[PDB]
Amino acid sequence: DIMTALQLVLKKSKAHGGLARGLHEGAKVIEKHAAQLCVLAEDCDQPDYVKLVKALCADHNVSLITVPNAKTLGEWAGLCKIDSEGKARKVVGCGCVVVKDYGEETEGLHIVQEYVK
RNA sequence: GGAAGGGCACCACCAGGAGUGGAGCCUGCGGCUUAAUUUGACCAACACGGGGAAACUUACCAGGUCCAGACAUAGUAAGGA
Ligand SMILES: [K+]
Ligand SMILES: [K+]
Ligand SMILES: [Mg+2]
Ligand SMILES: [Mg+2]
Ligand SMILES: [Mg+2]
Ligand SMILES: [Mg+2]
Ligand SMILES: [Mg+2]
Ligand SMILES: [Mg+2]
Ligand SMILES: [Mg+2]
């Protein structure tokens, strides 16, 4: 249920628009201290990318979660075009995702907060 | 109709007034010139387009910006369009 909870929280944040995508924006948002959580994709070919993400998250004391596939993280971040037929096409991978505000409390928020802690 | 008859009009005349046409200047038109000298109009065009334009107006000419190219599909793309 942890993965489903994370997906639900990310989708609700996207609906509220309180989430950031990409490291170039992720570092800025995290340094603002407004980042309440960070999500990193495991499928990264740049060790410096993951090292910087982890170091910044640890330094700024921000909850960190990992995802196996970056394309799945991008899909959960809304970086796709939804077709009436079914799952959205034209997906683009998203290495990192950050959250500024959850908008409203949700069932998955509690599960995520319990897991990360 | 350089045919006849009847009638009528100061955008016709008669009887007259002011005149205009001549001079200087203002303003519109043609021509010429010009990078352009934007252009319509030739009784019923020509101080007309309410048109007396320094910029704007502006339509012309010599140059420099910008998209204020919705929407759909495809491509690129958060390792950033
Ligand atoms: K005279
Ligand atoms: K006139
Ligand atoms: Mg006369
Ligand atoms: Mg007379
Ligand atoms: Mg005279
Ligand atoms: Mg002229
Ligand atoms: Mg007449
Ligand atoms: Mg001009
Ligand atoms: Mg002018």
A40 DSSP β-pair partners: A66, A96
Residue A78 contacts strand B, CB under 7 A: no
Cα–Cα distance measured from residue A73 to residue A2, given in angstroms and rounded to the nearest whole number: 14
Q: Give yes or no for a contact between A116 and A63, defined as CB atoms under 8 angstroms apart.
A: yes
Q: Is the Cβ atom of A48 within 7 Å of strand B at any atom?
A: no
Which positions in strand B are less than 7 Å from the protein's CB atoms?
A: 74-80
Nearest to A65 by CA among A112, A114, A5, A8: A112
Check chain A for breaks (C–N over 2.5 Å) and list the residue before each, or none.
none
Q: How far is the CA of A91 from the centre of ligand 2 (A)?
A: 72
Nearest nt by C1' to A21 Cα: B78
C-beta of residue A107 within 8 angstroms of C-beta of residue A98? no
The helix (H) or strand (E) run that includes residue A8 is: helix A2-16
Which tokens sit at A76?
């959960």
